[PDB]
């Protein structure tokens, strides 16, 4: 109807705002999510207000819309209407955080979706603020761990361990370790935090640059025979196997 003026929201969904004040002096709001109809009233007339619905299984759904129309917070509560099951915050910049909640209001799992679609999945979370972590990139997945301080994703190949750290502030750094004792074969590397590049050397000689981009990609570029200059062009890693082959 044209009694309501409708407006698209973070995610892909349009909330209709009653063009006029309802019979009780407020603005009535209706939205459509998971084939449900959600309704609420607000003092605001831009689409900012709380809506509710109930599901067929007597889940309570609640859609808090930010004043700025830049963020939706979608909550699933069980029958009581208090005990929270899940919460998704979605920004207009295509970013997100989804959490599944446990009894005692504890987060059991958490998914950060970046603007670009890449994701950080935290699972098996414990009291110490620790647990399992996974990074879903374009083409492949990295697996590792997290603490309260940092997430570490790890790629192993022979005696080599490559660790990609993401600080709580979001800062990326990378380390290479190799238990190999022989100079001729030991993989070693230095991290340039200014250029986000890990340069691998073997027996004093630079072999390759792995660049960890702000677009959450990893590229590889080989050095010449004597390791004096980079050769050819950087190449994107499409698959995990490629990372492993870079550690061989």
């Amino acid at each position, epitope marked *: 109807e044209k009694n309501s003026v409708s407006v698209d929201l973070p995610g892909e969904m349009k909330v209709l705002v009653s063009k006029e004040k309802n019979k009780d002096g407020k603005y009535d709001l209706i939205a459509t999510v998971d084939k449900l109809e959600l309704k609420g009233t607000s003092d605001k007339n831009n689409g900012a207000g709380v809506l509710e619905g109930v599901k067929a299984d007597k889940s309570k759904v609640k859609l808090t819309i930010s004043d700025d129309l830049g963020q939706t917070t979608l909550e699933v509560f069980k029958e009581d209407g208090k005990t929270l099951v899940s919460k998704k915050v979605t920004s207009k910049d295509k970013s997100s955080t989804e959490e599944k909640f446990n009894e005692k209001g504890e987060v059991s799992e958490k998914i950060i979706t970046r603007a670009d679609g890449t994701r950080l999945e935290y699972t098996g979370i414990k009291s110490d603020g620790s647990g399992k972590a996974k990074e879903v990139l374009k083409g492949f997945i990295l697996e590792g761990r997290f603490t309260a301080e940092k997430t570490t994703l790890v790629v192993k190949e022979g005696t080599v361990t490559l660790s990609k750290d993401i600080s709580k502030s979001g800062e990326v750094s990378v380390e290479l370790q190799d238990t*190999d*004792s*022989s*100079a*001729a074969t*030991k993989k*070693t590397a*230095a991290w340039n935090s200014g250029t986000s590049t890990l340069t691998i*050397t073997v*027996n*004093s*000689k630079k072999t390759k640059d792995l660049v960890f981009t702000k677009e959450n990609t990893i590229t590889v570029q080989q050095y*010449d*025979s*004597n*390791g*004096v200059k980079l050769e050819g062009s950087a190449v994107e890693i499409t698959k995990l196997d490629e990372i492993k082959n870079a550690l061989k």
Partner: antibody, heavy 113, light 108 residues
Framework: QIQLVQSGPELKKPGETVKISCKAS????????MYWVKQAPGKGLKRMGW????????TYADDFKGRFALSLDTSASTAYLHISNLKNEDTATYFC??????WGQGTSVTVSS | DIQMTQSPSSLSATLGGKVTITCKAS??????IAWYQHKPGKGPRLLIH???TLQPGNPSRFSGSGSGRDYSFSISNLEAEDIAIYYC?????????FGGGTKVEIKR
């Protein structure tokens, strides 16, 4: 195994030239730059230069311009050090080295009348 | 070229002891230090690389530690056959440079 084997001891007079060889075996010669290092009593080890085994391009330390040249026979996996206008200061042991793990045995040069 | 300041220049120690040599770089060298033993009439011999890796063919009495600009190397349980000049080498740069050496003598 991997070996670097250098040419035998030399005695030269001032103003003469000497050419010291370093023969590499057990690896692909072009995979590693060759370093030359000077050892005189009263000094330790000082890098004289290095050469890119693939391109042949030498890079010289500041103190070793003018009289010193690095060259290659890549097919024979042999690197050469040349010194012209020999002076008393060139009396030293000279070593070739590749990577961190390979050294020649040294070449003793005595310049004297 | 990076300056590598090696200390001390000379060491005298009793059999069975731990001697330590330091090497201070003029900038961060990213753990790219190696340590060589040099005995009369031979090529230097690699003992330690990448700060703390022991090269095969050598006893684990030889060790190394450090990061950034500051590095150390130790011989534990010093033996009579450890007499040698020892050198640090930085290889962070193509223009590799050496410490000035440490002559290790036995006190008896």
């Amino acid at each position: 195994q991997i070996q670097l084997v250098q040419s035998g001891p030399e005695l030269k007079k001032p103003g003469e030239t000497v050419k010291i060889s370093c023969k590499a075996s057990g690896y692909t010669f072009t995979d590693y730059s060759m370093y030359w290092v000077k050892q005189a009593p009263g000094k330790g080890l000082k890098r004289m230069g290095w050469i890119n085994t693939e391109t042949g391009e030498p890079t010289y330390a500041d103190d070793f311009k003018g009289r010193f040249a690095l060259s290659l026979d890549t097919s024979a996996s042999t690197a050469y050090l040349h010194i012209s206008n020999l002076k008393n200061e060139d009396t030293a042991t000279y070593f070739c080295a590749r990577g961190l793990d390979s050294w020649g045995q040294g070449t003793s040069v005595t310049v004297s009348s | 070229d990076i300056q590598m300041t090696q200390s001390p220049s000379s060491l005298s120690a009793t059999l069975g002891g731990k001697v330590t040599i330091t090497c201070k770089a003029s900038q961060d060298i990213n753990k790219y230090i190696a340590w060589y033993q040099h005995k009369p009439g031979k090529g230097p011999r690699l003992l330690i690389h990448y700060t703390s890796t022991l090269q095969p063919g050598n006893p684990s009495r030889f060790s190394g530690s450090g990061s950034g600009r500051d590095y150390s190397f130790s011989i534990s349980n010093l033996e009579a056959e450890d007499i040698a000049i020892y050198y640090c080498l930085q290889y962070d740069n193509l223009q590799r440079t050496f410490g000035g050496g440490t002559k290790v003598e036995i006190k008896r």
